[model samples]
Target: SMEQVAMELRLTELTRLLRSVLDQLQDKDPARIFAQPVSLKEVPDYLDHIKHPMDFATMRKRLEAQGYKNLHEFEEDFDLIIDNCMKYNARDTVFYRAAVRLRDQGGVVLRQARREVDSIG
Candidate 1:
């Protein structure tokens, strides 16, 4: 029972951290590029460039579904979101610049989250 309690407690904290960081990403979006999945109809060639696509909405769904079994899983999807943007868009494009900014800020947020969890553990 004690082990179960600890597991639940850690899961709750992880969920909170993911949610908070996701909110930060949404709020910090300058171009609203990663808030949702790319419109396949609009960007018809998007699939041709990026192999794996990720977005905030998908992350939210996964988070809610308890799909992320670990912190690194969530981090991978976060990184993938930014990577997809940079991959599909040209270096001169706004999406690329936005992705770069997101990468920097997102890393900071992740560091903060880990340290927070570290304190708890």
Candidate 2:
């Protein structure tokens, strides 16, 4: 029944449908492939991981003290920081960490947990 729609939809019609669905999918990425949370040490360090405002020595400590509960929380709290970051021009590892998880619901399982900055890479 479901495959029928996919199989029979016209190329033009299906193309449009793909866009609509894809646009919606951008909201919460159902294809999220969460395997397991690795230790923070496994991935590259965030200090070496960032590009701008890199020397936010004071701000970094402040942000860390705020105890962000998730990546989204981190972004939301530091939106002032993100305003300059997500200007429709980046997707490096840091970008993903800062902007990508704004919609993420699995922050805890994935240890993007902000409150516990035992943050995994």
Candidate 3:
């Protein structure tokens, strides 16, 4: 098995970083660089997937070009946005809830559910 000389379990948590990625998937207008939004399941595994749909690096660069500053700014805005989005919409709340249920499943749980559904009909 591949092993590391040193590793930290806490480092594996990408929740905030992935949350930022989710923010850009929304209606950010000038900050939006992707042709359109791709859902979580649609996120490709290819290395270039990062480049095409505006990975964190490209997202930072694009926003920087617009004079954006500080990840804290993103955190603040995202916190507020999350506060409203989940509060105002049952569907949004359910989406997060569904993900929480499978948070530790560690694979394409939703995608496989879809495939299972498709196969049944």
Candidate 4:
């Protein structure tokens, strides 16, 4: 019973910070175009080009599951979200532009979070 509190809410400082980052992305994309996994039914060839697909839902799931052990792991998933878009869609497309904006915005959020967490230490 001693560690029940810890098990009940198993978030570390890093996990909370990463969740904030996901929140920012989700907020910006109101339609949630990237919120869930891309449907292969709609784009049947999607998986052929992108081996590793990442989405807001998947990232959120991992965060809830405590799948990430470090920031780098989180960043890798974040980057994949953008990278997959860029790889699949042309640079002139809406998806590519949105991905670019999200990546840039995510960078700012992460830098601010880095400072916030560092200050706590």
Candidate 5:
């Protein structure tokens, strides 16, 4: 229950932080825009199965196959864009730290799951 709560909290916080970043970017450049607010329900259930960051690269390709092309164009400056968008905000550190923590936790969980599966096998 604690792990689930932490994961939910971290995901919610990341969503909020991403929304704020998108909003700021939209204000600066209307052409490059994001969709409406997304929630945990919108994230694919299989995301937790992804163990390596490179998996995201394959995911990106899949998304591009489905017409998600903007991400490819913005890949280079995406982090800078988000950082600049949130630089003046007070929640920037909180957001960044939470994201890093979530990522670390995800990796730990993935490794643990893999080990358990191996043991079972």
Candidate 6:
């Protein structure tokens, strides 16, 4: 029945409904914060390929220690640094090692998603 319901409701519609629900829970303030909609269509496959934040923290620390400061510096020289590190490199040993030590856990998910997009482009 879940699949049937999901099929009846297109991905875009489903995302809208989900956002509505979330909005309600967050006091129905649409402009309360920056927001984006996510579709669940590729969740299963995507989840499998996802790299955890802990994995990237180690890499970030190493880079920071090496005077990299932030990803921007690396991006200047290696235009693909953000892409490679966030996407393909997220699952790589080097990235994973760095990610593990990251302090802000809340940003892990966003970082991973950004990496995925960067990798694809």
| RMSD each, Å | 1.8, 18.4, 16.5, 2.9, 17.1, 19.2
1-121, model 6: which lDDT tens digit per residue? 9997665445344334323332332232223221221123734454455333222233334343453433344333222222333554446565433333221332443355346435643
User: For model 1, what is the alpha-carbon lDDT of residue 69?
Assistant: 68
* Model 2 lDDT per residue over 1-121, tens place: 9787555443334334323332333334333311122124664453354433311233344343533323454344334333333543266755445445633442333242333333221
- Candidate 3: segments with Cα more than 4 A from true spot: 1-64, 91-121
Give the winner by TM-score.
1
In the range 7-91, model 3's lDDT, one tens digit per residue, is 2222222233434443433433233322233345654553233322323344444443432333344334334333333333365
What stretches of model 2 exceed 4 Å from their correct place? 1-57, 63-77, 91-98, 102-121
Q: Which residue window of length 10 is worst by lDDT in model 2?
A: 30-39
lDDT of 5 by residue, 24-88 (tens): 33343333222222123754532363222222233334333432223323232334334432432
In model 1, residue pairs whose N, Cα or C atoms come closer than 3 Å (at least 3 residues apart or on different chains), thus clashing, are none
Candidate 4 residue-wise lDDT, 1-121, digit = tens:
8597665444476677778877986777665678999999999999899999999999999998878866778878988988999999999998998888887777887787667756753
Q: How are the candidates ranked when ordered by lDDT, highest leading? A: 1, 4, 5, 2, 3, 6
Error of 2 at 113 (Å): 12
lDDT per residue for candidate 1 within 36-101, as digits (tens), equals 889889989888888888999999999987677677898899999888888777899988999999
Off by over 4 Å in 4: 1-11
For residue 66, give model 5's deviation from the true position in Å.
18
Measured on C-alpha atoms, candidate 2 has an lDDT of 0.37
**What C-alpha lDDT, on a 0 to 100 scale, does residue 105 get in candidate 1?**
82
Worst 10 residues of 4 by lDDT: 5-14
**Reference-based TM-score of each model:** 0.87, 0.21, 0.26, 0.83, 0.28, 0.18
The superposed Cα distance between candidate 6 and the true structure at residue 72, in angstroms, equals: 37
